[PDB]
A paper describes a structure:
Structural analysis reveals that BCMO-1 and BCMO-2 are strikingly similar to each other.
BCMO-1 has 39 β-stands, 5 α-helices and 11 310-helices as defined by the dictionary of secondary structure of proteins (DSSP) algorithm. The iron is coordinated by His175, His237, His308, and His522 from blades II, III, IV, and VII, respectively. The substrate tunnel is a bent cavity passing below the helical dome. The main part of tunnel (also indicated by the orange dashed line in Figure 2) runs from the entrance located between helices η4 and η5 to the iron center; the minor part heads to the interface between helices η1 and α4, which is likely the exit passage of the product.
Author numbering:
A (entry chain A), B (entry chain B): 1 to 529
Write the structure that this text describes.
Amino acid sequence: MEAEGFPRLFHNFENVPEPKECKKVGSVPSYLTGTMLRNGPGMFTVGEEEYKHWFDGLGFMQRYHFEDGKMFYSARYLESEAYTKTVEAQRIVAGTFGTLSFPDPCKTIFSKYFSEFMNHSEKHDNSNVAFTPVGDSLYACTETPHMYRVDLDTLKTLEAADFSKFVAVHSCTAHQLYDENGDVYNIGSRFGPESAHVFTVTKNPKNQKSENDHSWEHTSKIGEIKASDPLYPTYMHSFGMSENYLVMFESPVRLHLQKYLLSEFVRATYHDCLEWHGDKDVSIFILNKKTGEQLPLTLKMNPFFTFHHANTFEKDGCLVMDYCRIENAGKFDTLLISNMKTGEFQYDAKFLPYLTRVIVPMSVSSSAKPGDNLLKSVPWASGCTSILQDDGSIRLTERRVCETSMEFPRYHWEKINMKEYRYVFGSTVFGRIDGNLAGVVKADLKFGNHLIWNRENPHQICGEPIFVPNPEGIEEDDGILIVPIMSSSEKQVPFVLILDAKTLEETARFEIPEARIPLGFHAFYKPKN
Amino acid sequence: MEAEGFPRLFHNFENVPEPKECKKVGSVPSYLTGTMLRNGPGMFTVGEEEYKHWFDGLGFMQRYHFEDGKMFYSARYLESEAYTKTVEAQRIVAGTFGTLSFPDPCKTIFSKYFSEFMNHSEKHDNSNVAFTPVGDSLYACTETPHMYRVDLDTLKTLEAADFSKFVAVHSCTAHQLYDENGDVYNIGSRFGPESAHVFTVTKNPKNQKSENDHSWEHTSKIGEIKASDPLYPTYMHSFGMSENYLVMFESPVRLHLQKYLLSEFVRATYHDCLEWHGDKDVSIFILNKKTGEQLPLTLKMNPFFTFHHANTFEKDGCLVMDYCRIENAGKFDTLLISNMKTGEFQYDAKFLPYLTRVIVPMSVSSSAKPGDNLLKSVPWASGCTSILQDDGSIRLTERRVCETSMEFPRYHWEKINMKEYRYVFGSTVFGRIDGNLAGVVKADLKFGNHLIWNRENPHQICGEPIFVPNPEGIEEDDGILIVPIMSSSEKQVPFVLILDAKTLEETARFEIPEARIPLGFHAFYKPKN
Ligand SMILES: [Fe+3]
Ligand SMILES: [Fe+3]
C-alpha cells in the first residue's frame, strides 16, 4: 500500500468487525445520537486482476455510531453475490460498471446461449452506492434492481431484495427519494424497441398491512415516459421530486442499447456502452405524481450532465430544480481509477460540477408571445430565463448558484424537503481548477452568502456532508454537519468532522482508529430519536 | 484548401483524365521505359461527412508513364461499386475500413434481420491499396476478395474479380506475392468457431486451359493453419515467401471476431474491432508451398507488428525473414485522419517501423540441448538467436538492420526474389523521432553502409521507392529508383524523383503539373520491354 497519494485509497480494504471508540477532540450536541451508514467501494484488486473504474470497487460499508457523546467505527464488505463469487474464485467474476466479467467459453456467438441471451438478465448486485430507507430498515443499493437489507448495528448482510419482482425495469437509480410518509420513489429504464423511463412509488410498509415492516411489496408504476431515441436512452444517476411532480433530465450521456444488450458477446462493459451526444439538447421530462401523466410542455436546455439533484420544489406555478451541473461529463472516463490515481481527475475543467438552478414554468399564459421570458414576472427568478419559442416549446437557461465546484449535495430534509429552502451543503471531492482550499461548501440559494470549511492540508478529502437538525431549533441551518474526512496520506489520520451548520465552525472531530476510510460515495444518518 | 500542411492531402482529388507531359529536370537511363500505376486514397469527404482513417479514402489511381526519356501523368478514381454509389450521394454511403455507412433502421437486434445477419455478406470493394499482376494484366486490390482489372494505358476500371469464387475466404491480403512463373500466392482468413488462415496459389492463367490470359480461375488451397484463438485471429497486412515456404506472423493485432460479426448492430467499423493483445507472444506459422504441410516447430517471439515483409529466403537450412518491425501498433489509431492532419503521427515513437531480420532454423539437431542457440554455428546469423526451449519450442530474437525508421520496403525482385540478397529500399513517410531529414533509405542487409536521400524541405514526403534494373547490370543495385515525392504545401510542386540505386544520388526529377498527388500507398512498375 502506497504511503501517499490517491493510489493509497485504491488498495483493498479489510473488515473492521468490532466497533471501536474513536478519539474525540471537542464537543458534540446532546442530539447527536444515531447511526450513519456509509456506502462505497473497497475491493479494487483480486489476485493480479484490477477493477477499472471508481464505481467498480466491491461494496465496503462503514458504520459511524454516535452515542453518549462518543463515536464508534466499524466496517464490513457487503456479502453480495458479486463479492462472494469473486472472493471464492480469487478472480474478477461478476461484471460491474466498468470492468469485464471473466469470459465464459459457453457464451460465444457460436454457442447455444446466443439463441437464449435475450431471455436472460444477468444479476448485477454490487450494491455499493447508497442506502435507501424502507419502513424500519436500510437497503444497500446500486443502479440495478438487486438490493440487500443491512443491519444497522452489525453491518451484517441480510436478505436480498429484487425490485424487478414488482415493476418491469432493467436499471433504476440508487438514489430513490422519499417523503414524510416514508413512501419511496424511483425511476428505472425498461429497455426495448420503445425504451421507456418508468416512474415508481413504494408505499411505507409500516403504514399499511404488509408481510413485514421492511417490505417492498407495495410497489407500483406511477407512469412512464418514452426515451426520445429508444436505442439511445439517457443514462440516469438521480432525479428530482417536488410535492406534486417527479422530474428527470434526458441527458447527453446515452446508453448504446444494442451494444449493451449484446455486451456478453462483444465483451463490453456498461461503461463502454455510454456515449456523449453533445449534438443534442437536453430535455426536461416531468410526471405528475397524482395522475401519472406527463406535463405537456417541451422543455429544452443546452447540453450538460448532473450526477445529483439537490432539492426540488414548486413555487408560484414554477418547478424549481437545483442540481450539480457538469459541462461535459463525456462517458465518465475522468473517474477511471488510472486517472484518479494520478490526482489529475481534479483538474478536468469541463468535468467539474457546479451547483445550479433552473426554473420551469408549469404553464404558459395566453398573453405570452414567442421571445418572452416567462419568468419576467417572477422576481425571485432573476438569473434564470425560460423563453417561449416560436413552436410553443420553452428554452431554459440556468443560474450558477456558487462558483466553488461542489457535488454530493445534501440539505435539511426533515424541514424543507420538497419546499422552498436556502442552503445546499456539498463536498469538493471532484476537484477544482482555481486552487481553492474549500472542502465543504454551504451554498446560499437566496443571497449568495456562501460559507466554506477548508481542507487543512493537501491530504484531506471531504466526503458527503450530512445535516442533522437540532430538534429544539427553528432556522433551516440550526443543526450540525457530519462530514467524513478521507486521507490520502499516512501523515493524516482519517476523521469525522462535526461542524456547526450555521457557521461551518468545527465543534468536534473523531479520529478513525484505522489508517484509511474509503474514497466512498453516499451515507445515511438514522437518528436514534 | 489550406496553403500548407497535411490537411491539404485530405481534400478530395479530381480526375486528370488525359496524360500530361511532366517538366523534366535531368536525365534518365535508356532502360526507363514502362508504366507505373500507383494506388491510394483520394476521396475523403462526401457532402459534409468525412471518412475517418487513412485507409478509407476511395481509391484514386495514378499513371506515371516513362517513355522517350519523358514522364506522362494521369489519374482517375477506381469505379468500384463503392465509388459508383458515393458520387451519387450526399453522405457517406459506402462503408470502409474505418468509417460506418448511415444506419439502416430495419437492421436492429429487435428486427427480423437479427435472425438473418449471419447469412449476409456485404461486398467491400474499395480496392485502393495496391496492384497485383495476374497473367498479362494488373488488378487493383484491397484486403477483401473484391478486385478490379485496370487498363494500363487509360486507368479505365475493367471487370471485377471476386477471389472468393475460387477459394472460401472472407478476407485476404492485398500484398500477394508472385514468382518467375507468374504464380500468385496469398493468405486469407476463413472466420468461424475454428478460424483458419488459408494459403492459396493462383497458377498463371497463361500456359494453361483458362477463360483468358488474366483469369484467377486456377486458384487452389495449398493448406491452412488454425488461429491460436479462433475468436481473435490475427490481423494480417503481408506475409513472406521463399522458394519452398510461405510464412506469416500471428501478430498481437487481433480481430475481435464476435464484435465484427455483430458490427451492424453495435455500429462498429472493422477498425473498431481491432485490438492489441500485448500480453501474448507472437507466433511464426510456416507452410510448405509444395506439400501444404505446416512446419512442425513451435516458434515464439516477443510482441511486435509488421505492415510489410521485405524479402524472404532459405539458406543453410534456415528461413530468413526481413520485415519492417513496429514495437506497438495498437489498433492503428495513429493513422486516423485526425492524427495525420496534425503531423503528430510522425512522432509516435512506439509506432515507428524499423527494418528487421529474424532467422528460423527449419530443423533441430539431435545434439541440441535446451538453452542452446541453434544459430550458434551459423556465422552470418550474428545478432539473431533461436534458442531451443525446454518444451521443444524455439524462441527467436531479431536484429535491427537499420537505425533509420523506414517502411514501404522494396527490393530488386527480378534478381533476388526468394534469394539471399543485400538491399532493401524504403521510405521514411511514417516519421522519425530524431529530427532527421532522411527521405529514402537503402538499407544494407550484410552489415554494410546504409545510404540516404534527404528530403529537401519539410513539405516533401517520400513515397514507396521502386527499383528498376539496368538490363546490362550484374550488381544487385545496378539500376534506378522511381520515388513519388508528395507535397504538403502549395509552395512545393509534387514530383517523381529518379535516383541512382548505387549511390541514391538524383539523376532526374519529373514535376507533376498538378498541385497534389495523393498520400498514397503502393505502386507497380510494368516495364515496356
Ligand atoms: Fe451518487
Ligand atoms: Fe501496404
